[PDB]
Amino acid sequence: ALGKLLDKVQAYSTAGGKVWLSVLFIFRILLLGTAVESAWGDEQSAFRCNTQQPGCENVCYDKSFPISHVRFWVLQIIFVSVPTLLYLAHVFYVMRKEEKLNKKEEELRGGLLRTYIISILFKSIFEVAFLLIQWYIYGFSLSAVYTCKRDPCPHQVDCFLSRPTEKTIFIIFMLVVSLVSLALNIIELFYVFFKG
Amino acid sequence: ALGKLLDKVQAYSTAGGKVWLSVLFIFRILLLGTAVESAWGDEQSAFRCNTQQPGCENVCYDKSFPISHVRFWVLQIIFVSVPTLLYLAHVFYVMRKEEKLNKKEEELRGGLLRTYIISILFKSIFEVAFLLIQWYIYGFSLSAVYTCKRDPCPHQVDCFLSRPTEKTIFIIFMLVVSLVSLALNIIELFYVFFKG
Amino acid sequence: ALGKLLDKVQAYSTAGGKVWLSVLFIFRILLLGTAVESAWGDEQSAFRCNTQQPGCENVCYDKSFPISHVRFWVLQIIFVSVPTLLYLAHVFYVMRKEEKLNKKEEELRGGLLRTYIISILFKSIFEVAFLLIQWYIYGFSLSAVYTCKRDPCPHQVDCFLSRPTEKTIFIIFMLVVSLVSLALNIIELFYVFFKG
Amino acid sequence: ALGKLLDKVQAYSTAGGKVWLSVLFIFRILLLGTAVESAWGDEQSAFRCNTQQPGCENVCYDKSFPISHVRFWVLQIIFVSVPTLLYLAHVFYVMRKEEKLNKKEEELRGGLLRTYIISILFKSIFEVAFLLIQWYIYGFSLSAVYTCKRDPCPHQVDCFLSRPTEKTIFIIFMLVVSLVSLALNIIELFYVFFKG
Amino acid sequence: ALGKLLDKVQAYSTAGGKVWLSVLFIFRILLLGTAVESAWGDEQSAFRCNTQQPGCENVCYDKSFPISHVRFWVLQIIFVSVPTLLYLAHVFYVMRKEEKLNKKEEELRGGLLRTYIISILFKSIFEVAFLLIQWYIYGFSLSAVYTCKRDPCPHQVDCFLSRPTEKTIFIIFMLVVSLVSLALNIIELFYVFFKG
Amino acid sequence: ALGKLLDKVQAYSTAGGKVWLSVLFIFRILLLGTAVESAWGDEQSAFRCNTQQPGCENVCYDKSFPISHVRFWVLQIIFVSVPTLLYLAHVFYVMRKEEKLNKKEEELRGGLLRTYIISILFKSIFEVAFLLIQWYIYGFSLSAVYTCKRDPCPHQVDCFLSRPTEKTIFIIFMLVVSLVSLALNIIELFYVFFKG
């Protein structure tokens, strides 16, 4: 039954869309659950600042990481999977209506490409927007020493992160994967557009 | 078999009801299990007050959070999924009775729209009630410093929360999702009512 | 296959029995695993008494909670699901015997209502018994300060519980659900009895 | 498919064997995973003795509990499920051989009751043996204060257990369940033996 | 479908091979996941030596246990399941080739016993090799007091293990199971060899 | 259904490819989830250096392990499974196109070996590249004493690892498995190439 269901969902799509779904499944969803989630396991437990003031660790950790990268990548992978599901539901409803019309009439370039172009444009726009936001907030490296200058701590305090090399490696890896997806969408659009 | 079962459950519904079920599944149930649950992981472990009195942390944490937002959203998502299931069970029983009457007679605007309107009204009422309760209790922001004035602590004590920016972001996100659902229900009601 | 199996288990029952099974599944089993289990997560870790005697915390925590509410509700939900399963197995065996007699004879008010009445009476009796036991042991509120008077501690010691508001809310919620089930069983009995 | 498989495994057995399988599933396997496992969660973490000698806690905890009750009940539930599976595999092989002989000959009181009696006798023997062992080692109660007299601790030390009331309740509960099973096996044997 | 798949995998094998597969599944894989894994849960957390030198605990724990028994039993259960899978894949390929030859010719003592003998010999050899290795490294008991004589600790230090009785019981239990399997393989070989 | 699906995925492949898939599944994916993951459980919790400077442990642990071996093996097992999936998807699309041409024409040495050779060459290249990287970074042993010379610690500090024998054993084991796979790929290539 599983095989048949798979056929039903992915049997009517482009080959570049198929390899995009492959790089979505085997390289993003598989990587996020297996290995990169445990690297952000002991985030707040190993974060250690250098003072004796009670509660300076919480405000300095909050000012260091406004949002952890795992939940940011989860929101990124949710907001780029919605238009594909919308296009699939629309083409499923249209295929069902045309099949019903075929069954009722056997007993007696259009909206699809428009929705396809719209879905591809929204996917590329959300990808480049999330890349610009991540470049604006964090950069693409983590230093082992962070300087904190927030109340109620005294003037300046030093805090030390937890394993800042492995997270740098995984940040660069997800950046490479997102750039590959952004290039592949434009490749697919120019492959489908110049056949007119 | 899975595909067939899905057809059986969702093949007789409105398209706005279909996109409401989509925003129920992919945006509420998927978001609650994956990312936002781990943000409320170390709630009571990282909560730290500034005193030496034994047991002031427990009473100040209790007075700060009367109920955590995760269980509140779980009760919200339970109390708005009951009338949809009731409508589906009622239309399933009516469809089974009409199919049995059709099978026994082949060998020889009404209650449905009423229940549909009732289910939509109860869904919108429970949504706006839970929004008013959450606006009354917490507001829509978390400050990093909380002042506690409860026995057996001395006069006033300061307590520091854990990562109050990320929880503010997720609170605003769930507020936007609930407002979108509340608008979509009224859109569906006015779409189905003016066809008379 | 799943759908068919469901049909097989629940296709021959009363409609009040169907909504009782609905309030059993979606309101008791679903609520116990999702949200209310994590509220009793850090029970013994956050329980803190006010002394320096080694081991007073264990005996005072034992005298405070003779049995936690989660395991008590699990025993309550087990002891009220046995007679329904017994009635279903009995009617399945009787239906199989009558179907075998029909197949062997096509090639050529009674015990059921008695067992139904017995199952409903045992369900209501166990419900009111567990409610009386929970009213006798704990009451329906948790105070934030408990006084302990047990050896080997000195004369009287104070202990502070962990988040006593949220547990009060969930205790009141499960009480309301159990009272609704107890009323619904009597409603079903009077609905099925006055048709004679 | 599930339903059919269930039919295949349990369609040829005695009714007392059916209710024995019911009390095996819903009362032993279901109870061990859900509630009683979490009661033995923080066993060695909350065990606290009264001294300053390093390492006295480990030897006194070892002399207190030679084997925890959870693993003892797991071994008990394994050693009483083997003869039922052996009888089922034997009757499956005999049914397959007789069905093959029937298919090869349509184209042209004995060993079963012996194995049934042997399986019932071995089940009752292992039940009463495990009950005698548990009565010999622990008794049927846990005191909150234990006296330890083992090297390298000094002369006598006091140790305090963790929640000794709840474990007493569950020990008495499993004792009642095992006595009910032991009585039911003898009831089934005398029900099947006096029909000769 | 499950039932059919099971038939497909185990329908062509010896009865002693069937009871060997039974003692492989219900007594090794079932026992390792359920109960004996939690006994080695807090291994390094409860291991406590008697000194104040920083880092003596790590080197003394390393010299005490070169490899924990759980991973050793996992490697033992992997290295004795490979030849059975190899024999099954070989007989599956040979059965497929003979079935293809039968289908292409209906439209118009040998290698198997050799591989069977080879698989049984390799299984018995790896079993007795792992038993000799475990007898050489650990013995078959754990003492509660271990003497450590390794740098950078001072001259001799005492360390105390965690619950050394329960692990002794489980070591003796797995030894009995492995000896039963080693005897059963030779019984199966002499049962299949003297029929010539 | 499962069996059929398995047939569909693996019924058209080489026998050396089949035993390569066997050594991929039963020896890499099975070993990584069961036993070797728990050995790297308490990595940063048991790592202990010998100083009193706050935060020297984080920078010395970061300089010791730039990336843990578990995530490195996960990236290794991902980057060698992509060309097999690409070859399978390509031969599936070609088989579907040829089957469609056969169905449309019944109603009225090439690209495959090229892709096979390309997939085998890329697999062997990525294997030897990951082996060279692991030989360059870590070596194939872990010492129990590591010397750290990084700011903001003083001149030289000693740090002690956690269980450095078991990790050495598992590193040697995965090295042996990878060398066996690298030899088997060349064996398969020379077996398929000299048949011309």
Residue numbers in the entry:
A (entry chain E), B (entry chain D), C (entry chain C), D (entry chain B), E (entry chain A), F (entry chain F): 6 to 113, 148 to 235
Sentences reproduced from the published study:
Gap junction intercellular channels (GJIChs) facilitate direct communication between adjacent cells and play important roles in various biological processes such as cardiac contraction, electrical coupling, cell differentiation, and death. Cx43, also known as GJA1, is the most ubiquitously expressed connexin protein. We identify three different N-terminal helix conformations of Cx43—gate-covering (GCN), pore-lining (PLN), and flexible intermediate (FIN)—that are randomly distributed in purified GJICh particles.
The protomer-focused conformational variation analysis of Cx43-M257 GJICh particles in the POPE nanodiscs (condition 8) showed six protomer classes in three distinct conformations designated as GCN, flexible intermediate NTH (FIN), and PLN, which accounted for 37.3%, 22%, and 40.7% protomers, respectively. In the FIN conformation, the density corresponding to NTH was slightly shorter than that of GCN and PLN and was more kinked toward TMD than toward GCN. The map density of the FIN hemichannel sub-structure contained substantial noise from different NTH conformations as the FIN protomer class was the minor class (22%). When the final model of the FIN protomer was superimposed on that of the PLN protomer, we found only a slight movement of TM helices in their cytoplasmic regions and a 50° kink of NTH toward the cytoplasm. Another superposition with the GCN protomer showed a 20° kink toward the extracellular region. This kink, together with the movement of TM1 and TM2 during the GCN-to-FIN transition, half-blocked the CHS1-binding site and formed a hydrophobic path from the site to the membrane opening. In addition, four N-terminal residues (residues 2–5) were not observed. These results indicate that the FIN conformation is relatively flexible compared with the PLN and GCN conformations.
